[PDB]
């Protein structure tokens, strides 16, 4: 894989409960991908054209804790499992992929970069099988073309007896379809 990644934590379990309740986060923001938490689960958000995109089944209808207080969702599509908030200052906006390269790369919450073979518009095969538990918490994470552009975000895993052989994702196209119906 050409692409690499590392993570940096910003908050602990306590300051997260606090920030959750005040909706106000002073921490400086960086990175293409944000690691997000509610009370009951963790997941990922990918910034693309100034919107922080993630899944509904992680974020629900919630606000994002921000510097000027809670940020209201700018896009909400329950049935796509997609939501987006305006990207906080300093998040690194990613660029959409359109060249349609066949081999993709999933970035997990562990900052691992996993080879995927595109099988269709919103489906991708894992060249190498992984535990479901290993992917759990990476919904919202980006699938990248080899150039580092974003093709989609991770939505669900195709799996059997706790082993995942494929990923279902929201193609960067659907993020247009929600924006138009705004």
């Amino acid at each position: 894989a050409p692409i690499t990644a590392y993570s940096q934590q910003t908050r602990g379990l306590l300051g997260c409960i606090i920030t959750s309740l005040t909706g106000r986060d002073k921490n400086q923001v960086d990175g293409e991908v944000q690691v997000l938490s509610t009370a009951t689960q963790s997941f990922l958000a990918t910034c693309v054209n100034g919107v922080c995109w993630t899944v509904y089944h992680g974020a629900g209808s919630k606000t994002l804790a921000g510097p000027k207080g809670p940020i209201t969702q700018m896009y909400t599509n329950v049935d796509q499992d997609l939501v987006g908030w305006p990207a906080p200052p300093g998040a690194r906006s990613m660029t959409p992929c359109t060249c349609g390269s066949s081999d993709l790369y999933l970035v997990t919450r562990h900052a691992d970069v996993i080879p995927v073979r595109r099988r269709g518009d919103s489906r991708g095969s894992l060249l190498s099988p992984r535990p479901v538990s290993y992917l759990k918490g990476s919904s919202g994470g980006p699938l990248l073309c080899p150039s580092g552009h974003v093709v989609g975000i991770f939505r669900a895993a195709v799996c059997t007896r706790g082993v995942a052989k494929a990923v279902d994702f929201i193609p960067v196209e659907s993020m247009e379809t929600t924006m138009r119906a705004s």
Binding site: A5, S7, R11, T19, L21, V29, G31, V35, A39
Partner: peptide
């Protein structure tokens, strides 16, 4: 009622 919180980030190269 609780807002979602950024607890970390991932840097890409």
């Amino acid at each position: 009622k609780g807002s979602v919180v950024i607890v970390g980030r991932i840097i890409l190269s």
